[PDB]
Structures are given as structure tokens and as C-alpha cells.
Amino acid sequence: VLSPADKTNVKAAWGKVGAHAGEYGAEALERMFLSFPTTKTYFPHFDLSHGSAQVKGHGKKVADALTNAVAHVDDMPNALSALSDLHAHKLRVDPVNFKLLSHCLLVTLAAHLPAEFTPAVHASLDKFLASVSTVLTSKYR
Amino acid sequence: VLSPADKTNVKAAWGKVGAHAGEYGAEALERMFLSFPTTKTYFPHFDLSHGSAQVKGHGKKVADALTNAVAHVDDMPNALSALSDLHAHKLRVDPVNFKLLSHCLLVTLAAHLPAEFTPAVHASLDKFLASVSTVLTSKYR
Amino acid sequence: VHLTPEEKSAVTALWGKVNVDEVGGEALGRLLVVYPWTQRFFESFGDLSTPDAVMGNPKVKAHGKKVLGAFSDGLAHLDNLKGTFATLSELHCDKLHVDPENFRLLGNVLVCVLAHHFGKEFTPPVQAAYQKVVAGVANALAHKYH
Amino acid sequence: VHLTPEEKSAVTALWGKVNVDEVGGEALGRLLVVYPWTQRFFESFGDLSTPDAVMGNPKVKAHGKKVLGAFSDGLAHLDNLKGTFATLSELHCDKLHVDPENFRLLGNVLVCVLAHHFGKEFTPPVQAAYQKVVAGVANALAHKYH
Numbered sequence: 001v002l003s004p005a006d007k008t009n010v011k012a013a014w015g016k017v018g019a020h021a022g023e024y025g026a027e028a029l030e031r032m033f034l035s036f037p038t039t040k041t042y043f044p045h046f047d048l049s050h051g052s053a054q055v056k057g058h059g060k061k062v063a064d065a066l067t068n069a070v071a072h073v074d075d076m077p078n079a080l081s082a083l084s085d086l087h088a089h090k091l092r093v094d095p096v097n098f099k100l101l102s103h104c105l106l107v108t109l110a111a112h113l114p115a116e117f118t119p120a121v122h123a124s125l126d127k128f129l130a131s132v133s134t135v136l137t138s139k140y141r
Numbered sequence: 142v143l144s145p146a147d148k149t150n151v152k153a154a155w156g157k158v159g160a161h162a163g164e165y166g167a168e169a170l171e172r173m174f175l176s177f178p179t180t181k182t183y184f185p186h187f188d189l190s191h192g193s194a195q196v197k198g199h200g201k202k203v204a205d206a207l208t209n210a211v212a213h214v215d216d217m218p219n220a221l222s223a224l225s226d227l228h229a230h231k232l233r234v235d236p237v238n239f240k241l242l243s244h245c246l247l248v249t250l251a252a253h254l255p256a257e258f259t260p261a262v263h264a265s266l267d268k269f270l271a272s273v274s275t276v277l278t279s280k281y282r
Numbered sequence: 283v284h285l286t287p288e289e290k291s292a293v294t295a296l297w298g299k300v301n302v303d304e305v306g307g308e309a310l311g312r313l314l315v316v317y318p319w320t321q322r323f324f325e326s327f328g329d330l331s332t333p334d335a336v337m338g339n340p341k342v343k344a345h346g347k348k349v350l351g352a353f354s355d356g357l358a359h360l361d362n363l364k365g366t367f368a369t370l371s372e373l374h375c376d377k378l379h380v381d382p383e384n385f386r387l388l389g390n391v392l393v394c395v396l397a398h399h400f401g402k403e404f405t406p407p408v409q410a411a412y413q414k415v416v417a418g419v420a421n422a423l424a425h426k427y428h
Numbered sequence: 429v430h431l432t433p434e435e436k437s438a439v440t441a442l443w444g445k446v447n448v449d450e451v452g453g454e455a456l457g458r459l460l461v462v463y464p465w466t467q468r469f470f471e472s473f474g475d476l477s478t479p480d481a482v483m484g485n486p487k488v489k490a491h492g493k494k495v496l497g498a499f500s501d502g503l504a505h506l507d508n509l510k511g512t513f514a515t516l517s518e519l520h521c522d523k524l525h526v527d528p529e530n531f532r533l534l535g536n537v538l539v540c541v542l543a544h545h546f547g548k549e550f551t552p553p554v555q556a557a558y559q560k561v562v563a564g565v566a567n568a569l570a571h572k573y574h
């Protein structure tokens with residue numbers, strides 16, 4: 001469960017990300033595809049090379065979903081309901097992969113938020129991404 | 142989420158186990174220690190010799206907790222509240238190990254329930270043990 | 283992994299009693315029922331709507347037999363699983379786009395199917411040896427991913 | 429596990445800029461803050477009740493130096509990580525009773541600390557190389573468990 005401090009930390013950090021959310025989303029995906037090649041099995045129709053327009057576009061979508069989750073941090077199961085349906089029933093991404101994207105998102109944030117990424121904020125962001133991941137895999141079976 | 146069909150399958154299967162639960166708990170622990178030796182890092186204070194009375198006693202406690210969870214399958218967070226506190230704040234077993242014990246419990250049930258361990262019941266039991274694991278790790282951070 | 287002479291003996295001894303056809307079909311079928319997202323690779327197999335439809339599906343059974351047959355051949359290469367499964371590793375990565383996590387799921391289901399069939403004969407030490415094998419095969423099949 | 433010569437050179441180049449003592453204390457501290465159940469091994473270290481209590485804990489800092497010191501020495505032996513870390517693997521299993529999952533968590537935190545420190549210099553290709561390294565080190569430390 002996200003604590004009051006967690007939610008304060010997540011909102012502050014994502015607020016600092018600001019207009020860069022889409023950029024950071026694309027970067028996190030690139031980091032994931034390079035660091036964890038098995039995740040590429042879910043994107044065989046994508047151009048996954050550096051500078052990919054498809055990755056850039058997807059990055060925006062992922063970022064937008066996270067921004068919405070932050071806006072509805074006390075009701076994420078319902079805010080992310082359609083997205084959870086999509087992953088559970090159509091895309092059918094194995095649940096183990098959500099930790100991989102979450103880690104790459106953390107690394108991206110760490111690389112861009114020197115002052116903001118304190119150990120406490122680090123902890124809160126990790127919990128937040130784990131919670132988003134839990135919601136996105138909640139309808140798999 | 143455990144479906145009404147899941148709950149029916151779990152209650153029926155555990156009913157068949159009956160008074161053998163304690164025994165099966167000890168067997169599942171033995172299977173876990175042998176198949177996944179890293180789990181022994183949580184029991185250096187135990188006698189792990191063959192037929193260990195200490196392991197048998199612990200298997201009984203684990204089994205009893207599962208029996209209680211089945212009896213309260215509609216409200217497992219509350220039924221397992223004290224146990225969740227214990228694992229989160231004292232024992233502090235890494236969450237990855239709960240999947241290992243769950244698998245060994247499944248294997249134990251499979252070996253003792255030839256008629257009952259249908260694919261559907263297999264699926265329901267796996268969901269149930271995952272749900273128990275989720276509750277037991279819910280207060281870790 | 284690395285099996286001891288005693289574990290290698292236990293593995294081979296039990297495998298000599300295995301109906302690969304039945305166990306293969308059961309294992310793949312239960313994979314698709316217990317972890318239904320794994321059905322994503324098998325749209326061409328037809329009806330997978332219910333557990334009974336999955337378990338009785340002719341293509342599921344065929345394809346379970348083929349998979350466990352290759353698994354069986356691998357048991358003659360216990361000290362070089364990576365070498366023997368190198369070709370199939372590349373195939374599953376580049377041609378089939380199969381997340382290697384699926385290999386691990388199938389391994390766990392296979393252990394359940396063996397326990398279900400053999401009962402008390404599937405002792406904790408025998409299970410432990412087979413856990414080493416299914417882990418080794420999964421790791422071998424994942425090894426050439428890129 | 430293994431890296432391309434381009435990746436080995438990238439790892440070595442970045443590490444030359446790393447203050448191992450400081451990064452070690454930071455990594456161990458963040459491990460205990462982000463995954464607080466890992467505090468179970470360090471009851472004798474005193475106050476671990478708040479993030480600041482953890483990060484500035486003198487014993488946490490001292491141990492972080494020791495741990496990353498051994499990590500750093502191992503970077504000279506990327507072709508033989510299992511051999512390099514064999515005695516530490518045995519020690520963490522037999523004497524310290526440390527679940528090897530902790531090594532994987534530390535690796536993840538270390539990658540975050542490097543990203544935090546180096547910023548844009550910690551490029552996705554450089555991260556990928558270090559992911560190979562921390563996975564290899566965690567696997568090596570896990571290898572002699574029994």
C-alpha cells in the first residue's frame with residue numbers, strides 16, 4: 001500500500017518530470033530492450049533500433065498512462081481498468097516483464113533527477129511502479 | 142481475484158486433504174528445502190535432519206494457517222493479518238520464496254490427490270496459494 | 283546446472299517409465315489452462331475456450347508430444363544442455379518470439395504432472411533432481427536469446 | 429552473461445570514475461531503504477529506523493565499502509566470475525545464511541546509484557553492459573549455495 005509520504009513523493013517527482021514524461025518513457029523502453037533482450041519478443045512488429053519512431057510513440061503512451069495513474073493514485077485499479085484488460089486478454093505479456101520496465105523507468109528517473117531522486121523518493125517510486133504493475137496484471141487469470 | 146468457482150474448487154480440495162494437512166505441510170517444506178536449497182537460509186536455527194520433528198511442527202503450523210485461510214477465503218487479508226505482520230516485520234523472508242513454497246505445496250497436493258487434481262482444480266489451487274502469498278507480503282514496505 | 287551421478291541415475295530411471303505422449307499433452311494443456319496468457323502462441327491450434335477443450339485439443343496434444351520429445355532427447359546431454367538446445371534457443375527467440383519465462387512455467391507444470399502421475403514414487407529427492415533438469419533445460423533454451 | 433569488447437571497455441572506463449567507497453555505502457544504504465526486509469541481516473548495525481538513519485549509519489557505510497570493494501576487485505575477472513566469487517558464495521551460504529535474491533536486489537540498486545551519479549553519461553548501452561555485470565556477479569555469488 002502507498003503511504004501518505006509515498007504519494008507525496010511520487011507526485012513531487014512526476015511533477016518535476018513534467019513535460020519530459022514522454023521522452024523519459026521512450027528512454028525507459030530503449031533501456032529495457034537493450035538491457036533485457038527477452039522483452040523484445042513482445043514487439044516483433046516494432047522497429048526497436050535507436051531513434052525508432054515506434055518506440056518514441058509508445059513511450060508517450062506509457063508515460064500518459066503513468067501520469068493518469070499518478071492523478072488517480074487512490075483508485076488505480078479502476079483508472080487503469082481498460083489497460084489491465086488489454087494486457088491480460090490481448091497482449092498477454094508475461095507478468096515477470098513488468099518488473100523489468102519498472103526498473104528501467106527508475107533508472108531513467110535517476111539519470112534525470114539528481115536532486116529529486118533521494119533514497120526515500122527512490123523507495124516510493126519503486127513501490128508506485130510495483131503497484132501499477134500489480135494492477136496491470138490483476139486480470140490475467 | 143479468486144472467482145466463486147475458484148473458492149469452490151479450493152474448499153473441496155482442502156476438504157479432501159482433511160486431517161492429512163499437517164503431514165502435507167511438512168512434506169512440502171521438505172520438498173522445498175531439497176529442490177530450492179536457498180530457502181534453507183531462513184532456517185539455519187532449525188534441525189533439518191531427516192524426519193525432523195522441528196520441520197514437522199512447522200509444517201503443521203503452515204498447514205493450519207492455510208486451513209484457516211480456506212475457511213475464510215472471502216476475507217483472507219483479515220484472517221491472515223497477524224501472520225502478515227509477522228512475516229513483514231520479523232521474519233522478513235524475501236517475497237520470491239513464497240512462489241517456491243507454493244509450488245512445493247502444489248506438487249505435494251498433486252502427489253496425494255490423483256482424482257481431485259484436475260486442470261481446473263490445479264489452476265484454482267495455484268491462484269489460491271498466490272493470493273495467500275500476496276496477503277503475507279502485503280505489509281513488507 | 284550440474285547433476286551428481288546419483289541424481290542422473292534417478293532422473294534416467296524415472297524417465298524410462300514415462301509415457302511421453304500422455305505427459306507431453308498433459309503438461310502443455312495444463313500450461314495453457316493454469317497460465318492462460320501462454321495461449322497467445324497457439325491461436326492456430328483452434329478451440330482453447332475451456333479446460334476440457336484445451337486438454338482434448340488434437341494440436342495441443344501433438345504439440346506437447348513434440349516438445350517433450352525434444353526434452354527427452356536433451357536428457358542424453360545432461361552435461362551439455364546449452365550446446366544441445368542452442369539451435370532451438372535461436373529458433374524460439376528469432377522465429378517464434380517466445381518469452382523464455384514460458385520455459386520456466388512449463389518446467390513447473392511438468393513437475394506437477396509427473397507428481398500427479400507417479401504419486402508417492404515422485405519422492406522429494408526425485409523431485410529435486412527433476413527441478414535441476416527443468417531449470418537447466420529452461421536456461422539452455424534461453425541462453426542464445428538476443 | 430558475457431560482454432562484447434565494446435561493453436568491457438565501457439564498463440572499465442566508467443568504473444575508473446567511480447569512488448568505490450562512496451558508491452558502496454550509497455548502494456547498501458539504498459538497498460536497506462528501498463527493500464527494508466534486507467535489514468534483517470544487520471541488527472547489530474544499530475539505528476536503521478529512518479532513511480537518514482540508514483544512509484548515514486557508520487556501520488552501513490563501512491560495510492558498503494567492503495562489499496563494493498570485493499565487487500570492484502571482481503571486475504578484473506569478468507571471464508571467471510564464478511571462480512572469483514566462489515569463497516564468498518560459500519561464506520554467504522554457510523556462515524551468513526543470506527538468501528541470494530539479496531544479491532540481485534543489490535545489483536538493481538547499484539545500477540540506479542550509477543545512473544543517479546553519472547546522469548546522461550549512464551547511457552542505455554552502458555546500462556546494458558552493467559546489467560550483464562551485476563547479473564553475472566549475483567549468479568556467481570549464488571552458485572555455491574547448497
Ligand code: HEM
Nearest residue numbers: 039042043058061062065066083091093097098101132133
Ligand atoms: C508500467 C508498465 C506499463 C504500462 C504503464 C503500459 C502501458 C501501455 C499502453 C498505454 C499501451 C497502449 C495502449 C493502447 O494503445 O490502447 C501499451 C501497449 C503495449 N504494451 Fe504495455 N505497459 C506497461 C508494461 C508493458 C510491458 C512490461 C510490456 C512488454 C515487455 C508491454 C507490452 C506492450 C505491447 C506489446 C503493447 C502493444 C504495442 C503496440 O502494438 O503498439 N507493456 N502499454
Ligand code: HEM
Nearest residue numbers: 180183184199202203206207224232234238239242273274
Ligand atoms: C503460504 C505461505 C506461508 C505460510 C502459510 C506460512 C505460515 C507460517 C506460520 C503459521 C508460521 C508460525 C507463526 C507462529 O508460530 O506464530 C510461520 C513462521 C515462519 N515462516 Fe512462514 N509461511 C509461509 C511462507 C514462508 C516462506 C516461503 C518462508 C521461507 C522460505 C517462511 C519462513 C518462515 C520462518 C523462518 C518462520 C519462523 C519459524 C520458526 O522459527 O519457528 N514462511 N510461517
Ligand code: HNI
Nearest residue numbers: 320323348349350352353370374378380384385388419423
Ligand atoms: C510458449 C510456449 C512454448 C514453450 C513453453 C515451448 C517450450 C519448448 C521446449 C521446452 C521443453 C522444447 C524442448 C521445445 C521444442 C520445440 N518447440 Ni517450443 N515452446 C513453445 C512454443 C513453441 C511454438 C509456438 C512452436 C511452433 C509451433 C508451430 O506451430 O509451428 C514451437 C516449436 C517447437 C519445436 C519444433 C521446432 C521445429 O519446427 O523444428 C520444438 C522441437 N514451440 N519447446
Ligand code: HNI
Nearest residue numbers: 466469470494495496498499516524526530531534565569
Ligand atoms: C543483504 C545482505 C547482503 C548482500 C546483498 C551482500 C552482498 C555482497 C556482495 C555483492 C556484490 C559482495 C561482493 C559481498 C561481499 C562481502 N560480504 Ni556480503 N552481502 C550481504 C550480507 C552480508 C553480511 C550480513 C555480512 C557479514 C557482516 C558482518 O556483520 O560482519 C557480509 C560480509 C561480506 C564480506 C566480508 C566477509 C567476511 O566477513 O569474511 C564481503 C567481502 N555480507 N557481499
